[PDB]
Amino acid sequence: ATKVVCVLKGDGPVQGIINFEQKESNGPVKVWGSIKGLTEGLHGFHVHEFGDNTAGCTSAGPHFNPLSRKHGGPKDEERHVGDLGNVTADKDGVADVSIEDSVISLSGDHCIIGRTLVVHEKADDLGKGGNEESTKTGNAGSRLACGVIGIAQ
Amino acid sequence: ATKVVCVLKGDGPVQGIINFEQKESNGPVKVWGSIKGLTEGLHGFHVHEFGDNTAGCTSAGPHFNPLSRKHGGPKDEERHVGDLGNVTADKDGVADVSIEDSVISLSGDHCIIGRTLVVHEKADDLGKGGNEESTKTGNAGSRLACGVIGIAQ
Ligand SMILES: [Cu+2]
Ligand SMILES: [Cu+2]
Ligand SMILES: [Zn+2]
Ligand SMILES: [Zn+2]
């Protein structure tokens, strides 16, 4: 794949549009877009395993993790494929998202197409929280909005 | 893939859940589930090209058609990959979908993961309407509900 898009929606005010682009079947994935409705500050931003919206964001499952690693930040060697870290919302509740990641992919074994993008209630502690939950979700809390990742024109 | 799912939602009362399962790469895809809120009778049922929900079902674009063929019914050689024909709603407004198709796939060039499933306003004429629109959309009319096709557990 080359271009993909995800529309985040939830039961609250959080909504956004996140694009993904991958020039090469191997490489870096550019991820960008905007999310509104958020409390100012850091929010966990992850690719969850299943593109299943049958029970809202809950049915998305845990973080996409085909290498069976523990949770971390995007720069850690130890992390889930789906660990994209935090995004930052401004005082207007708006997160201008721009991330480049070489672990997720739009092709191959780490393909995230058909999976779910989630934006969280609180900051992802990137696996340094000192408890089991930190090693699973970064303590990012509830899922405020999500969308299935789909193929874009 | 083995298993994928799609949650259909739209601007009106149509909603449903559709499952797709494929056991061999080859291989035939079983499609099944329930759609409620429909007018009794025949409704067009297609996989559209983009998993892009940015502007409702409109942004899903045209029928998935990597072979650049004309619109047909699922039994036709001449058809788009996305042409699943009609589903039938009963007098309760419920379409209990059960289709088997070996043109769509959950992998390879005809993969529908990350594309959009749509259920339409009217019957799909299966490319037998005698006008240009018939050879494109089957004259199935408006898009009542759609969802991105996602990976299920
Ligand atoms: Cu998460
Ligand atoms: Cu259609
Ligand atoms: Zn994680
Ligand atoms: Zn068609």
From Swiss-Prot, chains A, B:
Query: What does changing residue 6 to S do?
Result: Enhances formation of fibrillar aggregates in the absence of bound zinc
Give the recorded effect for residue 80 to A: Loss of zinc binding and enhanced tendency to form aggregates
Tell me the organism: Homo sapiens
Where do we find S-palmitoyl cysteine lipid attachment?
A: 6
InterPro entries documented for this protein: SOD-like_Cu/Zn_dom_sf (IPR036423), SOD_Cu/Zn_/chaperone (IPR024134), SOD_Cu/Zn_BS (IPR018152), SOD_Cu_Zn_dom (IPR001424)
Cofactor dependency: Cu cation; Zn(2+)
Q: What is its EC number?
A: 1.15.1.1
Quickly give the catalysed reaction. 2 superoxide + 2 H(+) = H2O2 + O2
Does Cell wall biogenesis/degradation show up as a keyword for this record?
no
Look up what happens after changing residue 57 to S: Enhances formation of fibrillar aggregates in the absence of bound zinc
The annotated consequence of residue 46 to R reads: In ALS1; 80% of wild-type activity; ubiquitinated by RNF19A
This chain is encoded by the gene named SOD1
Q: Coiled-coil segments, which residues?
A: none
Compartment(s) of residence? Cytoplasm; Nucleus
* The name this protein goes by in its record: Superoxide dismutase [Cu-Zn]
